[PDB]
C-alpha cells in the first residue's frame with residue numbers, strides 16, 4: 001500500500017549519459033549505439049541566442065568541433081565521425097557503439113502521460129524524479145543551469161521509451177524539451193525570446209486514477225452514489241480548465257477492483273473542484289493529477 | 305529552479321539486489337561482497353508469525369535451507385556457506401563475491417532525515433522514490449507483498465550509506481524496517497501482531513528548509529520582520545506536534561543566502577500551521593517537511 005511519486009530505476013539510462021562539448025558550451029547527451037543525441041543550441045555561441053542560424057552554425061562545424069566524454073563507469077573519449085541536425089537536436093555519429101545500449105524506442109508522449117526524468121550535469125547523473133506532460137506542453141521539474149540534455153523515459157518490459165530531452169526553462173519551475181524525433185513539445189523555440197505558454201489544466205484521467213488510489217488506501221469520504229456521464233463531465237471540463245476524459249483499460253481495471261464507477265468519481269471531481277472543506281485526500285487539500293492510471297495500477301496492485 | 309521529490313540514481317544499488325528463499329517464503333536481499341542481508345522473518349512460516357522463536361529457527365537452520373538467486377543482468381545461484389542472525393536481519397555468506405559492490409557504510413538515520421528507497425520484488429527492482437524517517441520511526445512509502453528486503457540509502461561522493469531494509473506494513477501507507485546493525489526503527493517487532501504507533505509530528509527543520517526553498521524561488525510573502533526564538537518555537541512545538549528544532553550549517557547556509565533568519569521562518573510556521581489564508585507556497589496549501597536542508601541546497605544551489 002501507499003502512493004508516492006515513483007520513478008523507474010535509472011541504471012539502464014545512467015549507462016547512456018555522456019557530456020557533449022562544442023566550443024565554449026557544454027551540456028549532456030544520450031549515447032545509444034553509435035549515436036549521441038544532444039541539444040542543438042550547444043552550437044549557438046551564447047550571443048546568437050536571440051537569432052540563431054542553426055543551418056549556418058551546422059555547416060560551420062567539423063567533426064572535431066565536438067567532444068564527447070564519459071565520466072561514469074569506464075571512461076573514454078569518443079571520436080566523433082559525423083554531425084547531423086534533426087529538428088531541434090544534434091545527432092552525432094561516433095566510432096564506438098555503446099555496449100550498454102538498452103532496447104529502446106522514440107515515441108512522443110501526449111499531455112497527461114508520465115515519465116521518469118534523469119537529471120544530469122557534465123554527463124554525470126545527479127537525481128531522478130517523475131513528471132507529467134502538462135496540457136500546455138511543459139513539465140514541472142527541478143533543473144539548474146547546465147542540465148539540458150537530461151532525458152525523460154519510461155520502460156514497459158525490457159524496452160526503454162526515450163520521450164524527452166531537456167532544453168529550456170520558461171518560468172520558475174517550468175521547463176520544456178524535445179521528443180527524440182526532433183520536435184519540441186508545444187512548438188516552443190530554442191531561442192531566448194518571449195515565449196507565451198498555453199493555459200494549464202487539470203488532467204481529468206489522472207485525478208480519477210488518484211481518487212481510485214485514495215479509495216484503495218482507505219480514503220473514500222468523497223464517494224457518493226451520484227454519477228456524472230463522461231459527456232456530462234467533458235462539457236463541464238471545457239469551461240473549468242479540465243482535460244477531456246478518455247477511458248482506458250487501466251482506469252477500467254481500477255473501477256473493476258474498487259466497485260466504484262468512473263462516473264461516480266467524475267461527480268466527485270465536480271464537487272471537489274470548489275474545495276475540500278478542510279478534509280484531506282491522501283494527504284492533500286487539492287486535486288492531484290500527478291498520478292496516471294498505469295502508475296497507480298503498478299503501485300497499488302503491481303505488475304508482476 | 306523548481307523543487308521536486310528527487311531520488312538518487314539507483315544503478316549502484318540495483319547491482320546488489322538478489323532473491324532470498326527460505327522454505328515457501330521469498331523476499332529480496334542485499335548482496336555486498338560475500339554477504340547477503342535479508343529480513344529474518346523469511347525463516348518463519350505463517351505458522352509462527354504471531355509468536356516467533358527466531359533464536360530456535362536459526363539453530364534449526366542449515367545452509368541448504370536458503371537459496372540466493374540473482375535475476376538482473378547475468379542470472380546465477382549463489383551457494384549459502386554460512387547463516388547468522390543480527391537483530392532482525394539474516395547475514396548469509398555466499399561463495400561468490402558481488403563484483404559490482406560499491407563503497408558503502410551502515411548508518412542509522414534519525415527522524416527528519418530523507419533517503420532514497422529502491423523497491424524490489426523477487427530480487428528485481430521495480431521503482432524508486434524518496435521518503436523521510438517520521439518522528440514516530442515509520443516511513444510513508446509504497447510497498448506491496450514481497451517488498452521486504454528493499455533498501456533505502458543515501459550517497460556521499462563514492463560512498464553509499466545503507467540506512468533501511470523494509471520489513472513490514474503496519475497500516476495503510478505506513479511502513480518500517482531495520483537498520484543494517486539489526487535494530488528495527490522505533491523498536492517495532494517482526495511478528496504479525498498489532499503494534500500501535502507513536503504520534504506523528506511535523507519535522508520543523510525540514511519545514512524551515514522548504515520555506516527557504518520558497519524564498520529562493522521568488523516566493524516570500526510569508527516573510528515578516530517578526531522573530532521567534534528557537535526556545536519559543538521548541539516550547540510551542542512540544543504542544544502542537546512539531547519536532548524540536550535543531551540548527552545545522554545547511555540551514556545556516558540557506559539563511560545567509562536568503563538574508564532571512566531562521567527565527568523569522570519559525571514565526572511564519574507558527575502562523576501557517578493554522579491556515580495559508582488561501583495562499584500557495586510552491587504550489588501547495590500544506591506545510592511541507594519532505595525536504596531537508598541538504599536536499600534544498602543540492603536542488604536549488606547545486607551544493608551537494
Ligand SMILES: CNC(=O)c1cc(Br)cc([N+](=O)[O-])c1N[C@@H]1CCCC[C@@H]1NC(=O)c1cncc2ccccc12
Nearest residue numbers: 041143144145146148167168169190191192193195305
Ligand atoms: C531563461 N532560461 C532558459 O533556460 C531558456 C529560455 C529560453 Br525562452 C530559451 C532557451 N534556449 O534557447 O535554450 C533557454 N535555455 C538557455 C539558453 C542556452 C542553453 C540552455 C539555457 N538554459 C539552461 O541552461 C537551463 C536549463 N534548465 C534550467 C535552468 C535554470 C536556470 C538557468 C538555466 C537553466
Ligand SMILES: CNC(=O)c1cc(Br)cc([N+](=O)[O-])c1N[C@@H]1CCCC[C@@H]1NC(=O)c1cncc2ccccc12
Nearest residue numbers: 001345447448449450451452471472473494495496497
Ligand atoms: C501486511 N502486513 C505486513 O506486512 C506485516 C505486518 C506486521 Br505487524 C508484521 C510483519 N512481519 O513480522 O513481517 C509484516 N510482514 C509480513 C509478514 C511475513 C513476510 C512479509 C509480510 N509483509 C509484506 O509482504 C509486505 C511488505 N510491505 C508492504 C506490504 C503491503 C501489503 C501486503 C504485504 C506487504
